[PDB]
């Protein structure tokens with residue numbers, strides 16, 4: 214059995230702290246506003262994994278009303294979601310992620326991001342893709358208000 | 372054979388009628404503007420199912436220019452789409468849906484929404500996921516101008 | 530083995546040149562700004578194919594800093610991407626594309642667009658779907674500032 218999932222997340226720029234994206238610190242003038250560490254990339258991937266498994270979403274599992282998650286490293290959340298999939302007998306088929314951001318430039322960090330995911334998903338990096346595009350100065354990402362991320366995943370029984 | 376589909380839909384708030392989302396009435400000051408009942412969630416799912424089967428989209432099947440479909444119940448339209456899939460020998464593998472909205476609050480309604488889909492797709496609820504995220508006040512969804520939905524589906528032969 | 534991919538692209542209107550979408554000239558008062566011919570539909574599909582194969586994105590393979598791609602017909606880029614998949618032992622399972630645009634009207638062009646893809650992907654048109662939706666005058670698409678495209682693909686080992 215193969216199961217599909219989709220994730221989507223957005224956070225706004227403006228938090229004076231390191232910009233951590235897909236577990237990688239990317240140099241920038243500001244960071245992302247969030248309850249947790251603000252890793253919008255890992256959140257979208259986590260929601261895709263929960264989604265594929267019909268386990269709801271990260272708002273259910275890791276609520277922003279709970280101080281337990283304040284400033285949390287989002288790799289902990291990602292690993293929890295993947296562990297739920299593994300406990301149900303599934304593993305990664307393949308993952309494809311699209312970072313939608315006007316800045317910063319993602320290209321120098323893509324490989325480091327793929328390696329974070331290979332480690333946390335106990336996967337071959339050949340089964341993991343991270344991409345980036347701008348929206349050519351259009352919309353909220355084009356105005357540098359924040360970053361959006363889309364992810365799709367296939368999980369397979371084993 | 373397994374086949375993938377993707378749906379995306381948006382409607383604007385402002386129509387003085389019940390807000391029906393994934394077949395569930397959610398309390399809100401206004402409803403969604405559309406030719407049919409405005410159920411942006413079922414529309415996106417419908418387009419994902421039509422899309423997986425290479426049958427076009429809801430604009431083709433249930434045209435905005437067509438009086439038959441003025442105020443149409445979107446559960447009826449979803450079931451039309453799924454019946455076309457079944458006629459081609461396919462059934463639901465699994466479905467994951469992402470509601471993108473600042474308001475209303477979706478969490479209290481998720482399970483009711485899943486149960487609507489399990490009934491309308493004659494499917495096990497374990498194969499159906501409905502998620503929601505805000506965009507942290509960014510973009511037209513973040514400003515409560517309307518609601519966006521993304522959906523992905525896998526259909527399998529039998 | 531089956532592999533999933535997702536692509537997303539946006540370009541802004543305002544280049545005085547033919548509007549080429551999914552390889553098809555669509556009448557409109559202006560075209561799209563881009564380094565290549567600006568075919569946002571083929572770019573998104575290309576990124577889905579690269580993504581499924583974990584080969585990065587069109588920014589990596591066809592950089593905008595490189596004059597070799599200036600004005601390039603985006604069918605060349607799509608064919609390169611698909612050829613990489615074929616070289617790795619994969620072929621099209623099925624493809625579903627969503628053009629997100631307030632104008633121009635896509636419906637008259639959908640079948641021509643599908644035929645471009647059936648040719649370039651050496652595929653049966655029954656495995657190829659192209660959809661369109663508006664965002665009901667919301668956001669940058671709704672304001673007719675540009676066009677966005679989402680695509681999902683399933684590739685299967687040959």
Ligand SMILES: CC(C)=CCC/C(C)=C/CC/C(C)=C/COP(=O)(O)OP(=O)(O)O
Nearest residue numbers: 352353471510511512519629668669670677
């Ligand atoms: C946010 C979202 C649903 C992203 C999914 C992919 C995407 C950007 C699709 C194109 C249509 C869209 C939702 C545009 C957003 O305009 P905007 O909200 O950026 O416009 P505005 O703030 O300039 O009105």
Ligand SMILES: [Co+2]
Nearest residue numbers: 222223504505
């Ligand atoms: Co979120």
Ligand SMILES: [Co+2]
Nearest residue numbers: 380381662663
């Ligand atoms: Co629509």
Ligand SMILES: [Co+2]
Nearest residue numbers: 346347538539
């Ligand atoms: Co792009």
Ligand SMILES: [Zn+2]
Nearest residue numbers: 222223253256
């Ligand atoms: Zn988040």
Ligand SMILES: [Zn+2]
Nearest residue numbers: 380381411414
């Ligand atoms: Zn609709």
Ligand SMILES: [Zn+2]
Nearest residue numbers: 538539569572
């Ligand atoms: Zn492009």
